[PDB]
Amino acid sequence: KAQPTEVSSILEERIGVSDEANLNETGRVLAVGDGIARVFGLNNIQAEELVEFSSGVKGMALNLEPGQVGIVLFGSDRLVKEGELVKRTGNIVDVPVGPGLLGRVVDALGNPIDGKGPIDAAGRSRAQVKAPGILPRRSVHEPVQTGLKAVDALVPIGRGQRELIIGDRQTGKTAVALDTILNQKRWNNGSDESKKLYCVYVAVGQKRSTVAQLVQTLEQHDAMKYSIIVAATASEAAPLQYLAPFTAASIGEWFRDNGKHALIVYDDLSKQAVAYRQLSLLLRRPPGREAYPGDVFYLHSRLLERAAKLSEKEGSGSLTALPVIETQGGDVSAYIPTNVISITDGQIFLEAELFYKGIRPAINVGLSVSRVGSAAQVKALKQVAGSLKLFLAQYREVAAFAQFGSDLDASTKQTLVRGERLTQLLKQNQYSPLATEEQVPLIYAGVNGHLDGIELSRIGEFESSFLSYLKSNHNELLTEIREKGELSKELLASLKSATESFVAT
Amino acid sequence: QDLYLRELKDTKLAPSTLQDAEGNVKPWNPPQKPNLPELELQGPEALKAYTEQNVETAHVAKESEEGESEPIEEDWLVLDDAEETKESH
Amino acid sequence: AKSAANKLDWAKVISSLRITGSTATQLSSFKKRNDEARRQLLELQSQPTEVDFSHY
Amino acid sequence: STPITGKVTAVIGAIVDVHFEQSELPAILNALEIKTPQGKLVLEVAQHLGENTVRTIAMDGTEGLVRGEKVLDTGGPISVPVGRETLGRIINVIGEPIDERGPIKSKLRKPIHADPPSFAEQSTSAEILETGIKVVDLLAPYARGGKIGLFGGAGVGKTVFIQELINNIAKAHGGFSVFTGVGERTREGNDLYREMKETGVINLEGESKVALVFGQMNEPPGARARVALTGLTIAEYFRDEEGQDVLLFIDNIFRFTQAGSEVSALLGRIPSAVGYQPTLATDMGLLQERITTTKKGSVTSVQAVYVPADDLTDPAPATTFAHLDATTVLSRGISELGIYPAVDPLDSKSRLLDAAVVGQEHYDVASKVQETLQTYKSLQDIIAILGMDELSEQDKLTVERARKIQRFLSQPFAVAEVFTGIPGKLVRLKDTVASFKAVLEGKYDNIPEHAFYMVGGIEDVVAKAEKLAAEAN
Amino acid sequence: VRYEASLRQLEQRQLAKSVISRVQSELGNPKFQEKVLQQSISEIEQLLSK
Numbered sequence A: 001k002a003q004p005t006e007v008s009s010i011l012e013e014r015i016g017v018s019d020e021a022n023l024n025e026t027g028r029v030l031a032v033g034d035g036i037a038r039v040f041g042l043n044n045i046q047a048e049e050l051v052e053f054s055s056g057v058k059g060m061a062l063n064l065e066p067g068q069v070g071i072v073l074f075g076s077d078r079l080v081k082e083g084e085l086v087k088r089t090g091n092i093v094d095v096p097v098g099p100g101l102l103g104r105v106v107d108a109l110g111n112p113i114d115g116k117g118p119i120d121a122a123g124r125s126r127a128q129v130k131a132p133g134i135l136p137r138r139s140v141h142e143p144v145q146t147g148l149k150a151v152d153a154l155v156p157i158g159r160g161q162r163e164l165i166i167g168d169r170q171t172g173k174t175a176v177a178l179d180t181i182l183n184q185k186r187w188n189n190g191s192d193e194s195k196k197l198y199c200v201y202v203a204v205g206q207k208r209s210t211v212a213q214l215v216q217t218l219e220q221h222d223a224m225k226y227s228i229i230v231a232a233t234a235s236e237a238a239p240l241q242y243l244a245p246f247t248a249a250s251i252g253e254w255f256r257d258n259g260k261h262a263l264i265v266y267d268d269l270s271k272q273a274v275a276y277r278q279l280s281l282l283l284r285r286p287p288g289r290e291a292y293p294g295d296v297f298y299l300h301s302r303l304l305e306r307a308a309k310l311s312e313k314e315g316s317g318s319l320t321a322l323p324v325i326e327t328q329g330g331d332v333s334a335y336i337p338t339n340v341i342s343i344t345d346g347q348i349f350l351e352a353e354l355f356y357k358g359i360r361p362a363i364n365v366g367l368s369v370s371r372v373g374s375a376a377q378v379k380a381l382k383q384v385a386g387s388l389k390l391f392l393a394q395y396r397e398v399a400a401f402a403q404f405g406s407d408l409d410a411s412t413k414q415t416l417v418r419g420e421r422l423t424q425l426l427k428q429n430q431y432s433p434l435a436t437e438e439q440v441p442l443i444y445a446g447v448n449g450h451l452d453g454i455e456l457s458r459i460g461e462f463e464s465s466f467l468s469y470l471k472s473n474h475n476e477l478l479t480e481i482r483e484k485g486e487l488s489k490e491l492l493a494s495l496k497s498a499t500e501s502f503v504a505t
Numbered sequence B: 001q002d003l004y005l006r007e008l009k010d011t012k013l014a015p016s017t018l019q020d021a022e023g024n025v026k027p028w029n030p031p032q033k034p035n036l037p038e039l040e041l042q043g044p045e046a047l048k049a050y051t052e053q054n055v056e057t058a059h060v061a062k063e064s065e066e067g068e069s070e071p072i073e074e075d076w077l078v079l080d081d082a083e084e085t086k087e088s089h
Numbered sequence C: 001a002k003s004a005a006n007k008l009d010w011a012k013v014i015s016s017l018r019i020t021g022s023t024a025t026q027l028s029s030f031k032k033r034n035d036e037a038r039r040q041l042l043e044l045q046s047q048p049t050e051v052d053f054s055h056y
Numbered sequence D: 001s002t003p004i005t006g007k008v009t010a011v012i013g014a015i016v017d018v019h020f021e022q023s024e025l026p027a028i029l030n031a032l033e034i035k036t037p038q039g040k041l042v043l044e045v046a047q048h049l050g051e052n053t054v055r056t057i058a059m060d061g062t063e064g065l066v067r068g069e070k071v072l073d074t075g076g077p078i079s080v081p082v083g084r085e086t087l088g089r090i091i092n093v094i095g096e097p098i099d100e101r102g103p104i105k106s107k108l109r110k111p112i113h114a115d116p117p118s119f120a121e122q123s124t125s126a127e128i129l130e131t132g133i134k135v136v137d138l139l140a141p142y143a144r145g146g147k148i149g150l151f152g153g154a155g156v157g158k159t160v161f162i163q164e165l166i167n168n169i170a171k172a173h174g175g176f177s178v179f180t181g182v183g184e185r186t187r188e189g190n191d192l193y194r195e196m197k198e199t200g201v202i203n204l205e206g207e208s209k210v211a212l213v214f215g216q217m218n219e220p221p222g223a224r225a226r227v228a229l230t231g232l233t234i235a236e237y238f239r240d241e242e243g244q245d246v247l248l249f250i251d252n253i254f255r256f257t258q259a260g261s262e263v264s265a266l267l268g269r270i271p272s273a274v275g276y277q278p279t280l281a282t283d284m285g286l287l288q289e290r291i292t293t294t295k296k297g298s299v300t301s302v303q304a305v306y307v308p309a310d311d312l313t314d315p316a317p318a319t320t321f322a323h324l325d326a327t328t329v330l331s332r333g334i335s336e337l338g339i340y341p342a343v344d345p346l347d348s349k350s351r352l353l354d355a356a357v358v359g360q361e362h363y364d365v366a367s368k369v370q371e372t373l374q375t376y377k378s379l380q381d382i383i384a385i386l387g388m389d390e391l392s393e394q395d396k397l398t399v400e401r402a403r404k405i406q407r408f409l410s411q412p413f414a415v416a417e418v419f420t421g422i423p424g425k426l427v428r429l430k431d432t433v434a435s436f437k438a439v440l441e442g443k444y445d446n447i448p449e450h451a452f453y454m455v456g457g458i459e460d461v462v463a464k465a466e467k468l469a470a471e472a473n
Numbered sequence E: 001v002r003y004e005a006s007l008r009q010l011e012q013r014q015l016a017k018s019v020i021s022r023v024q025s026e027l028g029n030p031k032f033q034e035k036v037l038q039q040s041i042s043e044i045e046q047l048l049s050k
Ligand SMILES: Nc1ncnc2c1ncn2[C@@H]1O[C@H](COP(=O)(O)OP(=O)(O)OP(=O)(O)O)[C@@H](O)[C@H]1O
Pocket: A167, A168, A169, A170, A171, A172, A173, A174, A175, A176, A326, A360, A361, A428, A429, A430, A431, D351, D352, D354
C-alpha cells in the first residue's frame, strides 16, 4: 500500500546522509576489463575494503599499489564504465548478522532476494574473521542426529565436527544435508536451545530454479523458521561465489558466539574453486596444479577453520560444517578434493554405482569414515553398533569374494545373507528422517540375525511394519530410548522380547 | 531540500489520486477498481475451487455398518469351515 | 494399555503355531494393527483443529 | 542526435581498438557500427583499456580496415528484432534477415544481454512439459522450462526428431520454436531450412511456426559467442510478451564453448583448464539462468551436446551436465531396428523421473518399464545363444512384453508423412500412461508383436490388432 | 493469505511503473534550474560544517 511509500520515504529521509556526505574516498576509474578495475586515488583506502561504484555495484579493493588500486567487481562489468566516481564504504567487507535472517533468502551481502522487505540484522560482521585459536575450543561431545540410517549408524557427527560429503554428479549428495536439516525440525520445534540446532544452506553457482525448489521444499516441511539460504547462483559474478561462504561462515559465527549451536552446509566448494581460479587467472597470477593458484588450499582452509565447538568459557557454542565436493568420475586424487580431505575431519563418500543400483543413500562404507565422531555418538547407538561396522566390512570382504558362484560354508554364507539384509536395510527415501529411538530397533534386529529368515525384498515393508508395531505397542521403550539415549540390560531384554515378538511374523 | 521535498511530494501525490481519493487513475487508461477488489476479489477462489473447497463442505460421514447383524447362517458355516480348517490343522 | 492386548496376541501367535492355516484370525490381527496404526498417525497428525483467530 | 565518433587505432585479427573523444565512452557490451563498403561491421565493447580507448571484438571479417576511421556507437547493446515478423526468417547474430526476403518489419528490438529473471520470479515447482512423443513423455520427461541434453550424431533423424518436436509443441501447447545453429555447417543449414520449408513448419506465405538464427561457421568467434544470446533474447520475448511455453533449440553448445574460449584467448586472458576459457562457469551461467520458467510462461531449451573425444571429465560437458535436467540419446542401434524415433530407452534419463513429480503411477509404470527392458537387455545374450528354451514363464512373458514395448515405443511422425505416408499422432500423456500400464499388466499378450510397430496409442493398438487380424483372415 | 501477498506485490509493481510516471513528471521542470541553488545552499551547509 502506501505504507511501503511511508517506509521508503523514511529511507528517503535517510537518503540526512546527504547533509553529511563528505566522502574521503572518491577517485576516477583508470581501466576496467576482464572482471577487474584499476582506480586512481583513494589514498586513505584500507586493505580489503568494501567500496561502491557510481553504477551502484559494490566491489572489494583487493590489491593496493603506489599509483592505483585494483578493485574486483561484485557483478557484471557492463554496469561499470571507465572514468567514473568510486566511493568507498569505509569498511572491510561485512555482512548483516542476526536472528531475523532466519527464513529470509539473501545474496552474498545479506541483501534479501526473497522480496520480503528489509533484514532485521543484529549487527554487521567482517568476512575474513580469524578462526579461533586452539584454546577457546573443546573436543566434540554432542551428537548431530542427521536422521539418516547409515549416517547416524556408522559416521556420527559432533557439534562442530567438520565432515565432508564427497560424491559425484546427481548422486544424492544434496538430499543428505537436506534431510539432515529436516531432521533438525524435531528440536527446533522444541524449547531447549542447546538441543536446538540452526541451519544455514549455502547454494553457490547453481540453478535458480533448483534453489527455488529447495526453498519451496523447506517451506513444505517447514524448516524455514530455522533456515538461512545464501544464494550465489551461476548467473552471478565469480567474486560473489568466492565471497558468499565466508559471509555465511560469519553468520554461523554469530550464532556460535551467542552460545547457540548452528549448522552450515557448503554446496559446493568445487564451484567456489572454479570462481577463485577464475579470479586469480584474471589477476594474471600464475596457476599451479590443474590450473589452480596454489593458495586454493589456503582458501578452503581459512574458510573451514571457522567451525568448531567452543568451550564453556566461550558459552559452549558450536558450528558444524558440511562441505560438498563434486568429483569427476569417482576420482579421489584430483587436486581440489585431496586438499579438502586434508582439512575435514572425515569423509562421506557416495558411490555412483550404488545409486545406479538405486541404493539411496549410496554410501560406500569402506571409504566413508569420521575421525572423532565416536566420542559424540548417541550412547545407545554406540552400544548397538559396535559389531555393525565390523560385520559390514566383513560382508564387504565376502561381497567381491562371492561373485565367482562358488558355494561356501554356513559361516560365510550366513554373513552373506545377513549383510544382504543389512544392505537392503539401510535404504531410505528422501524427506524421511528417522529419530534415534526409531533407528535403534532396526539395528538391534539387524545385529541379532532376525532378518535372515525374512525375505530380502520383504525388508522394506518390514521396517515400517515393525516401527508401527512398536509405536503402537512398545511406545514406552521408544520414550526410554528418547530419554536415556542409552540401553540398560533391562531395556536390552525388553527390546529383545519386543523384537522377537514381531520377528515371529 | 527542494530536490527532496518536491520529488517526495510528487512521489506521494501522484499515487495519492490512486489510493487516498478514489479517482481511479488519471494516467492509466484501464481502470484499477474492477481488477483486484471486483474481478480478482474472487481471485484466490478463482485460484482455488469455489463452493466445495472454500465453502469447505461440512460433510456427514458415510455410515458403514457391522456385518448386517446376521450371526446364524454365517457363524455356523464359519464353525463348519473351522472344522474343515482344523482337519487341515 | 493396548500393549497387554498385543502381548496376549503374540501369546496367541505362539499358541497358533498349534493351528497352522488360520485364514482370517491373523488377518483380524492384521486389520486391528492396520487401523490402530491409522488412528495413531491420525491423532498425531491432528492439529488443534481450528483457525487461529488471534494470529492466523 | 549525438554521434559518438570513434577512431580505429589497432586491428589485430578480430580484436579492434578504438580511441574515442573525451567523456564519450560507451559501456561494456555495446554494439558499434562501421560503415564498410560491403555493409556494416559490428563491434562489441568488452574491455575499457583506459585513455578514452576501448577494446572490442569483431562480428564479421576485418579485412581492408584503415586505422583512424569513424566509429559509430549505438549506445545500447545489440538490438535484435522480435515479434511475429521473426517467424520463418533466417537471421544473423546482428539481427539482419539473410533469407533475402526483405527487411524484417518488427516493431520492437531488444538488447541481447538482458539480465536473468530474479530468484523471486522462479517458478518453484517444475511440472512436466508434455511433448507428444511417447518415449520422451514416458521415460525422460521434460521440465516445462528445463534443460535437455540431446546426444547422438547425424543421420539418425535428429532433425526429423526435432521437427516432430516443433509440430508437437505447435499442436499441443501452441508455443513456438526458435532454432539456433551456432557454428552450423552452412550447407547443412541450407538443407535444414529447405526441409523445414518442405515439412511445413516454415510456411513462406502462411504461418511459419519457428524462427531461425544461423551463426555460420565462417563467422569470427565474437559472432559465435553471441548467436546463442540472440536466440535466447528472441525466445525470451515470446515468453515474456505472449505468455507462452517457447522451445529454444541450440546446436551446438560445445561449439559455443569453443567460441567463448577463443574469445577469451583473443582478448589475451590467461587460459584455464583444458584450454577452455577461465570464465567458463560464468559464461555458462549467463546462458542457463536466462532460461527458466517464469510466472508469465517458460522457455524450455533442448540443445545438442557433442561429447569431445568421448570424455565426460572434460570440463565443457562436465559444465553442461551441471545444468541438464533431462537427457535424450539418439542411438544408432534403435534406428538400426527401424524404430522411429531412435531413442535409447535405457540412457535417456531425467532428474524429474520421480513419484513426487510425475505422480506415483507414472513413476511406477516407468519403473517397471525400465526394469523389464533392463532384464530383457541382460537376457539378450542367451536369447541369441540358447534361445527361448531357458526362458521360464516368468521370463518369456517379460521377453515378449519388452518386444511389444520395443515395437510400441515406435511412433508415426507428422514430419515423416512425405517419407512414410503414415500420419503422426500427437500422443497424449494420459493415454500413454494407461497404454504402457495395460501392456505392463499383460492385457494384450494375445495381440502380436507386429501390431505395435509405429502406432499412436492403445486405441490404435486395438485398431491395428483388428486390422491385422482381418488381413490375416 | 497467498493472494494477499500477491496483491501486495502487484501493488508494488504498479507503484514501480508509477515511479516511472513520477520520474517523467520530474523530468520537465525548472527544478532543473531551481535545484542548482539547492546544491548551492547545500554545499554551503556541508562545507560550513567544517
Ligand atoms: N533417499 C532418496 N530417496 C529418493 N530419491 C533420492 C534419494 N537419494 C537421492 N535421490 C535422488 O537423487 C537425485 C539427485 O539428488 P541430489 O541433488 O541430492 O544429488 P546431487 O549429487 O546432490 O546432485 P547435485 O550435486 O546436482 O545437486 C534426486 O533426483 C533424488 O530424487
